[PDB]
Ligand binder design. Structure first.
Ligand SMILES: N[C@@H](Cc1c[nH]c2ccccc12)C(=O)O
Ligand SMILES: N[C@@H](Cc1c[nH]c2ccccc12)C(=O)O
Ligand SMILES: N[C@@H](Cc1c[nH]c2ccccc12)C(=O)O
Ligand SMILES: [Cu+2]
Ligand SMILES: [Cu+2]
Ligand SMILES: [Cu+2]
Ligand SMILES: [Cu+2]
Ligand SMILES: [Cu+2]
Ligand SMILES: [Cu+2]
Ligand SMILES: [Cu+2]
Ligand SMILES: [Cu+2]
Ligand SMILES: [Cu+2]
Ligand SMILES: [Cu+2]
Ligand code: NA
Ligand code: NA
Lengths: 683, 683, 40, 107, 147
């Protein structure tokens, strides 16, 4: 039954109940007899008709980029969104939980919570907690299933080899190390970054914040800077990957050639609850073939429509409206055209000029089963697994050309815009930047299936935990000295970027601008004389700690909105080198400058980057080609830094013994697993 | 402990105990202190040294075509084989069971049982019963794991959708239907034949009967027609696949071009006990690449050595011996050179001129992890899954060129050899040939993991069964009328072959000879006058029924050797058509004709085809190019036949209702699952 | 359904398992061109 | 038509056969002798041996009197690399190409 | 030789054997008890300094043949990393063992590697596939180093 709602804590409890053991969902509130309980009659009638005609079975997999699946999910979301009040919303959610596919239900409920005004102040479990299948490697889940079946009867030898232990006879801990047995190319050397659960969750919440299928005036998100925020998120992700690759002495990724081959294969290592795994793609695959030529053509139709428009300064839309692409502020419209969210005429219906969910077809195994309930998705088919595939990164690199061209068509920033009269930066200093690998526990209890006794107690008698190894960094401070003639409010931006290319050349500003990562941005009040700004890494904007377990009621009062738009602390800095990897930090201080309303963004707590601070374009001052004559004002500063990495595996295991002859417990382990070295024994 | 041996029934019980729940194996008999208990000291010392140095962990997968893995397996097999008596053999097997990898142990034990003289009269469980992972689709095993974890608590909706039921609260039955969600090419239309468990088991037992690594004079198999038998098995498998494809109006397979691409991809659908699945290969893969060029060269080295030799009539071997390739009887040597088993000089050691286990590298995902304990195998890496991959069939087609060339170099059969003076066939008749699909239960209880209580009882409280759908045919009789002037012993051979090509042309004998399947061969005694030979399908040579469950003590006294060399009855005839698919049967009667000893084959009950009947080449009279002038003697007869297929799904469900609007329960089901049609309902 | 009228009218009690086409490139749709193997 | 790929799936078999000839000839020339299927060794060291070489390549080589059947080198294989297909080869209805006739090969 | 591959895996001996560089080889006289062998980089076999200018009459009396078969000192070690690149050194001591005449090589001063020292195959003990059971004797040693 739908648990009653009294306060926000009760709301959180109800939502957690709705999200618990989704694989085994288990009324008096008739849906067809409560049509008046919704704002829109059309949505409820459409949902009822579709449900009577049949929907995705609970025994299949919900695919994010399947047109039929997204259509059904949007119908469910419309049903949930237009509930009059929170009680009706809870009752409808409870009704849906035991009727429709679990994945689709979770998708729709998360979207509704993100976009419902009365859902403010509600915390939800992380996506990997709800459905670990899409974030945890298949072998770990298989070991968890083995332990569940045997009720922790595994013999000592097997547990020692797999690193499985039982703590307090109440928790099962399975060690999780990537290894090299699934290696396909050198790209996998950055697997600790691309396959990080928090990065995929960040992309998933980016999608949830600005869904492409939400393109109606009624929704409040239409009044925010959604398109520019999405584009800047993609651009910053690409820049961060560039820095991470440079840490490994690898060059920047190249755009994929749809007329050629994709050199980099990938091994998903993803298990689905239906019992099938995402297919593996071999190296050297020809992207365009006879089975997808149709879709290829469609993709081309988009490109020609976009690029040409950027060159011509305007685009003609199917609804009969012309969109200008000449002024800088038009960027938003462009983004809405490319990344979705463009609002057409009220009476207009149907597909627009630009079609969506087409790129994945260039990386798929085939189009025979597309649009069916039994389609087995690939990595590119889900927002929670797209970043794991290098092909998706190459596709993003190809797509970035549109925005690069658009910004190149604009005039360069003038010295007046880049200058802050009377304000100069004296110096910038930082503490030592150090990174290291450390353990983190992931609750995967929802992956296993419960017996009747466990179902009655709404809990598994034993907890199952995956002990993942993830990047992390030590705390550090940034100190800035600023001289100001007057007392004034200012915006301070701090970026991190490369110092050398993969060939060792000293990179110029023009070839660096696209690789700058905006690591911090904040408001400040300058006063007459000298000002010392000290920023701790803990307080950097929209940087969140590791997500706490939901079963423990999230053991702060602002976490509910921070978790939705937060970037993990663990990935704040790229992995360094034992001798120190050189990078360059950039600091700029500018005045506060200045239909879209900033109050809408402020009220929904969706303040990504500086959208709630100023009105300058996202990526400023690096989003346009730079004229060296008008750049390098006194209000901006560069500072070389070195990022180190340390190995704590042997820092604590301080014994006076040589290990030149020791061997790994498993032969596929890497240098990051020196704690698994065991001296060669004789049985 | 090793169960004591008193009689053959006790031996069977001991072997079954050794093969039970291999995933969870659980001494007083010290191995190092019983060196005198073995015939060869070198083997035991080598095994002890290797074991002390470490072997394949039980938590990894044993790969049939990995050089290191096969080396260790051969060491284990040598340890088992040279036991003085059966008691020492049992004690050594018990010692190994709880020390080494399960798959390697099973491989070595099966080889020893096949080749130990004192193991006669012992029945063993089918390979899919011991290790269902390599024969049952991953989704079925996942459903079995779910039922085990939940102890049969699945909700009615999920069970109905998946077709899972619980019988007598003691058995769990999971319906198993292939479907089309894994389709990659038209080849998969014959999946019911290539993926049949019995066909893969037949190839596995072919390998066990004549291992390629057994090339020493001491072994008795060296005195049999091993090479010719193996080659004829491969050739007959290819011919049977040709007939099956013709049943679907598909042309014969073409040899793979290592300089080109492999059009046909494949989806293994195989789960390994480590938690990883065999990788999927996309369509249009280039076979030769930079990562395998080395191996490619090696493959070429073999081809040049073989073909050239056949053209030159002799081959020079690394051991210093010259092997003639001019006489027909030299075929055996050729086969031993190609398929293994060639015996070199006694003092010679090391690799021979021809290297083995190289073809798989042309279909693998990469060579980075080859020769390691963590290598994830492909379909071609195992004898029990090779026939599932069309690439392996194309490789076999390429390899057949050697034998085709060798036979073409030989003189054609003369009319004297093909003729039986005084004997003519009057007529040949047969009953209606009909095929249909029917259910078969596979015990997959060994796939799940047992708890402590289950382990103590050496049994799972619930049995788990996969209800597969497999081909089958109705019984039929063959009647032959023969006129004989004298009373004499004769050999009768009955073949089945194509009538038309994929283009509808009337095929000639020369283009038919390589597609003839020897469906029967037997001895008979002709008498003066007319003789009526009646042969029932049940008594056809080396054709066995469906394998019984081992848990029920194999509910005949000759099954022990029949199961080792038997071909399934279910696949005796190719699938027909509702209107009748035309084929042609061929009958020939010849006299009995005539270092290799037939007594060795007779004693070991390894009488495949006519090896224990006469001395004519296997494939006679179709193994050589045919001269139409010397062919078509009075002792041979052709007879056109029609093979029909029927659907029993609706034959029993006789109700007066139209189903033009019904829909399948799952959208990926085929026309062979008409029993899953459900009328469109309204929820 | 499809039917072959080539032999529907040529109703004779003889077996044709050994007959050959007049021209070797003819198909199953030309069963009326089958001629028993003769000796010149 | 112009720009035709010589080796394809329909003639791979024949391609292999062609290779078998080349390897047998060139290697022999490098090794100074050739071993024949009939059991005779032909020297390829002296200038006057050219004749034998030609008979091996262009035909006319006489094997042992009792020997019968195909020799080490097979003939009538090059045309398959320029043909439209091998489906109808060895039949009375095969339509020849220019390379199929000595009177049209030079065209 | 190497310690890790480009993917960071711990390399085994079989995949290392073809990448081992014989940086030194020399004769010695062992005595009863303990012996401390100290080898300076300057005296490593067939390693020569930078070639002097010929115009200055080559500003040693053995340079004439050393220059013909010498490997530069500058390239003795691979470029390291500021934090230290890991590699592995291997040391083996064996007895002196045993148409080709060693006197011809000795007289012409063409003694590359151990051709003038012993008769073992060049590349020993890494020129053949290694059986782990027969390897790792007490007369051989591995040692991790950082460059
Ligand atoms: N600076 C971003 C968060 C962030 C830090 N590093 C990133 C890397 C990629 C994307 C976003 C980020 C913000 O305030 O919202
Ligand atoms: N005739 C074979 C058995 C057999 C029947 N059909 C086959 C198809 C393929 C291989 C073998 C067979 C024997 O006696 O041994
Ligand atoms: N050890 C070699 C010289 C040498 C050192 N490093 C090398 C690298 C490559 C070739 C030769 C060398 C010798 O004694 O002659
Ligand atoms: Cu690296
Ligand atoms: Cu429109
Ligand atoms: Cu519950
Ligand atoms: Cu941080
Ligand atoms: Cu078909
Ligand atoms: Cu040899
Ligand atoms: Cu038991
Ligand atoms: Cu049968
Ligand atoms: Cu010959
Ligand atoms: Cu030096
Ligand atoms: Na490919
Ligand atoms: Na062409």
């Amino acid at each position: 039954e739908p648990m009653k709602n009294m306060d926000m804590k009760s709301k959180e409890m109800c939502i957690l109940k709705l999200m618990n053991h989704i694989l085994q969902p288990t009324k008096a509130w008739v849906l067809e007899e409560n049509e008046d309980k919704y704002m829109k009659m059309e949505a409820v009638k459409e949902f009822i008709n579709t449900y009577k005609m049949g929907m995705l079975p609970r025994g299949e997999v919900f695919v994010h980029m399947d047109h039929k699946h997204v259509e059904e999910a949007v119908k469910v979301f419309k049903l949930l969104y237009f509930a009059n009040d929170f009680d009706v919303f809870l009752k409808t959610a409870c009704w849906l939980r035991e009727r429709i596919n679990g994945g689709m239900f979770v998708y729709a409920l998360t979207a509704a919570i993100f976009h419902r005004s009365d859902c403010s102040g509600i915390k939800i479990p992380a996506p990997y907690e709800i459905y670990p299948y899409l974030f945890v490697d298949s072998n770990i889940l298989h070991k968890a299933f083995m332990m569940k079946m045997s009720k922790a009867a595994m013999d000592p030898v097997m547990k020692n080899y797999y690193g499985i232990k039982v703590k307090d006879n109440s928790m099962v801990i399975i060690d999780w190390r990537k290894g090299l047995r699934h290696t396909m190319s050198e790209f996998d050397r950055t697997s600790y970054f691309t396959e990080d659960i928090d990065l995929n969750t960040y992309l998933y919440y980016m999608h949830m914040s600005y869904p492409y299928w939400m393109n109606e005036d009624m929704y409040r998100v239409n009044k925010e800077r959604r398109g520019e925020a999405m584009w800047y998120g993609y651009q910053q992700l690409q820049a961060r990957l560039r820095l991470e690759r440079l840490s490994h002495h690898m060059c920047d990724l190249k755009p994929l050639d749809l007329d050629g081959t994709l050199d980099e294969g990938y091994w998903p290592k993803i298990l689905l609850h239906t019992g099938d795994e995402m297919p593996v793609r071999y190296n050297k695959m020809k992207l365009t073939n006879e089975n997808n030529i149709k879709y290829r053509l469609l993709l081309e139709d988009n490109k020609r429509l976009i690029r040409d428009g950027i060159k011509k300064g305007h685009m003609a839309m199917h609804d009969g409206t012309t969109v200008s692409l000449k002024k800088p502020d038009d960027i938003e419209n462009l983004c809405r055209i490319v990344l979705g969210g463009f609002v057409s005429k009220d009476d207009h219906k149907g597909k627009s000029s630009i079609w969506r969910n087409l790129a994945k077809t260039m990386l798929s195994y085939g189009t025979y089963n597309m649009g069916k309930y039994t389609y087995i998705p690939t990595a590119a088919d889900m927002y929670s697994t797209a970043l794991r595939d290098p092909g998706m990164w190459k596709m993003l690199k190809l797509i970035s050309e549109y925005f690069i061209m658009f910004k190149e068509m604009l005039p360069k920033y003038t010295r007046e815009e880049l200058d802050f009269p009377g304000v100069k930066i004296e110096q910038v200093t930082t503490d030592k930047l150090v990174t290291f690998m450390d353990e983190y526990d992931v609750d995967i209890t929802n992956a296993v299936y419960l017996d009747h006794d466990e179902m009655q107690k709404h809990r598994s008698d034993m907890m199952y935990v995956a002990r993942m190894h993830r990047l992390n960094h030590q705390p550090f401070k940034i100190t800035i000295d600023v001289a100001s003639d007057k007392a004034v409010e200012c915006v301070v931006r701090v970026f991190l970027g490369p110092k050398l290319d993969c060939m060792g050349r000293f990179t110029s500003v023009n070839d660096k601008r696209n690789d700058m990562v905006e690591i911090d941005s904040f408001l400040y009040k300058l006063e007459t004389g000298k000002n010392t700004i000290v920023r701790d890494s803990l307080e950097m904007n929209n940087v969140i700690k590791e997500r706490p377990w939901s079963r423990n009621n999230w053991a702060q009062d602002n976490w509910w909105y921070k978790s939705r738009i937060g970037f993990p602390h663990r990935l704040l800095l790229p992995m360094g080198s034992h001798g120190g990897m050189p990078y360059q930090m950039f600091v700029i201080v500018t005045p506060v400058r200045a239909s879209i309303d900033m109050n809408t963004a402020k009220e929904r707590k969706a303040c990504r980057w500086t959208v709630c601070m100023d009105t300058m374009p996202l990526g400023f001052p690096f989003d346009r080609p730079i004229d060296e004559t008008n750049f390098y004002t006194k209000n901006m500063k560069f500072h070389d830094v070195m990022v180190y990495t340390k190995d704590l595996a042997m820092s604590n295991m301080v014994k006076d013994v040589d290990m030149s002859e020791m061997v790994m417990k498993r032969d596929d382990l890497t240098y990051l697993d020196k704690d698994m070295l065991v001296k060669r024994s004789y049985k």
